[PDB]
Design a protein around this ligand. Structure first.
Ligand code: NA
Ligand code: NA
Lengths: 252, 252
C-alpha cells in the first residue's frame, strides 16, 4: 500500500489549468513569480519538436501574467532522450532530478526520544517564529525571491489547508515543517532545522510528531538535488521510490 | 554477504601510521594538503576531553609535515554526543556525513546498456584522457587545488593499486571511475561524467562494466555531502547502508 504510492500523491500549489494525457499545466496568476506554482508537469515524453512548441505556449502564458521563467517536469521514472537533452542544454535550462521518498508512520514514531523540544501548530501567535526559521534557509533564487515567498506564506497560512510546525528549544524557534494531509497519505515539505541545532535529535523529534499525526497513513516527501535534509531522510529510514527530471530557466 | 559490508571495507588513501582500540591514525606526508589522506578514524566515541587531547596530538603531527587542517571521523552509525558537539561548533569545525552504499554486481550488470561507449583501463597511453575528465571536475575548485591532485595522480597511477577507467564517446573522453579491488568487494570512487554528457546512459554503461568485473563481489562506495552522482546511484539501485559523521577544520 505504501508500495503503490506515486508522484501523483505529491501536492502542487498551483491551479490546474489543463490536464490531458500528455501534460498538466499549472499557473497561479496572482503569484506569477513562484516557480513551483507555474509549470508544466508532463505525463508522457514530448519529442524534441513537441517540446519546442510547448516552450512557445508556456512562454506566452507566462509573459501574459508577468511570469518570466520557464519550467517543466518530465514523466515519473523516465530518462530523457539525448536529442532533447541536447536541446535543453542549448536553450540554457538547468537540469535536475526530483526524488520521491516514502516511509511508514510507525517507523517515524519510533524515532522519538522524549528530548526537550516543544512542538507547536503554527497560528497567528507563533507565525513569526516559523518565518524566522524560514529566513535561515538556503536561498537559491536570491533574497527578494525568498522574501516574496515569505509574504505569500504570511498571508495564506490560515486560509490554506496546509498545516505547519515550529519546534522550540529553550523558547527559541529552531525547526519547521509543512504538512499536507489527505486520507491516504501525509506529505511533508519545507522541512528544516537551523544549522547550529542540527544532528542533535531535533529533526527526529519533528519527524516522530508528524508520524504520530499520520496514524497508519504513510508519510511522503519529494526532495531535489539542492536539499541538504536528504542525508537525514536516509538515516531516518525513508525509502527511495522513483525520480523525475525537471528543468528551469529563471529568465525567458 | 552484502548484508555484512561495513565502512571497514572502504579504502583509505593514506599511510596508517598507527592503530589501537580507540582509533587509527593516517598520514600521507607527500600530500600534506590532501585532507582525506591525513586524518584520524575513530573506533569509539572519544569523551569531549579525550577529544581535546586528541586535537593536540594531531595538531602536532600535522604541523610537523605542513598540514594545517584538523580532521576526524567518528564510528559508524553513531550520533555525536551533546557536550562533544557543542565544543566542535565552538572550535569552528565543519560537520559532515559520509554515506555507505552497496549493491550486488548482478544489479549493476542488469543496467540499460549503451554499447557505443568505449571503456578502457588507464595506462601510459590514455592517462591524459582520464585527466581531461578528472580536471574538468577539479578545476572549479581552483587551479591550485586541481594542479595538486593532478600531480598526485601523475605520481602513482601505475605504481599504486587503484585501477582506473576512462569512457569514450566518439573517441572523446567523457567519463571516469576508480576501482579498488579485493577478494570480498569492488569499491568505486571518483566516478564522474562530463556535464554535456550526463543523464544519457553513460554512467549506467560504466556502472555495468564495473559489475561485470566485480562478478559476484558486492560493489560499494562512500559518498560525502558534496557528491554529484548521489542521485544517479539511487536511480541505479544502490542500497543505503549507514553513515559516519566527520569533522574538518581548515587553517588551524
Ligand atoms: Na492553514
Ligand atoms: Na595502479
Amino acid at each position: 500500500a505504501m508500495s503503490k504510492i506515486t508522484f501523483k500523491d505529491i501536492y502542487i500549489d498551483g491551479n490546474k489549468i489543463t490536464e490531458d494525457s500528455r501534460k498538466a499545466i499549472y499557473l497561479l496568476p496572482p503569484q506569477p513569480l513562484k516557480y513551483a506554482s507555474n509549470t508544466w508537469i508532463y505525463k508522457t515524453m514530448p519529442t524534441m519538436n513537441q517540446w519546442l512548441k510547448d516552450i512557445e505556449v508556456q512562454k506566452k502564458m507566462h509573459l501574459n501574467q508577468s511570469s518570466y521563467h520557464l519550467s517543466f517536469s518530465f514523466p515519473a521514472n523516465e530518462k530523457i532522450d539525448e536529442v532533447l537533452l541536447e536541446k535543453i542544454r542549448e536553450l540554457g535550462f538547468q537540469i535536475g532530478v526530483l526524488e520521491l521518498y516514502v516511509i511508514e508512520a510507525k517507523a517515524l514514531k519510533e524515532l522519538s526520544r522524549k528530548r526537550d523540544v516543544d512542538i507547536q501548530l503554527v497560528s497567528s501567535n507563533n507565525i513569526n517564529d516559523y518565518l524566522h526559521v524560514y529566513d535561515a534557509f538556503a536561498r537559491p533564487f536570491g533574497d527578494s525571491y525568498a522574501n516574496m515567498v515569505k509574504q505569500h506564506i504570511y498571508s495564506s497560512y490560515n486560509l490554506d489547508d496546509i498545516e505547519r510546525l515550529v519546534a522550540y528549544v529553550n523558547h527559541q524557534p529552531v525547526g519547521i515543517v509543512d504538512i499536507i494531509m489527505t486520507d491516504k497519505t501525509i506529505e511533508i515539505d519545507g522541512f528544516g532545522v537551523l544549522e547550529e541545532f542540527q544532528h542533535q535529535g531535533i529533526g527526529s523529534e519533528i519527524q516522530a510528531y508528524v508520524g504520530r499525526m499520520a496514524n497508519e497513513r504513510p508519510v511522503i516527501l519529494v526532495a531535489d538535488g539542492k536539499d541538504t535534509a536528504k542525508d537525514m531522510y536516509l538515516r531516518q529510514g525513508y525509502v527511495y521510490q522513483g525520480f523525475k527530471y525537471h528543468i528551469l530557466k529563471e529568465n525567458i
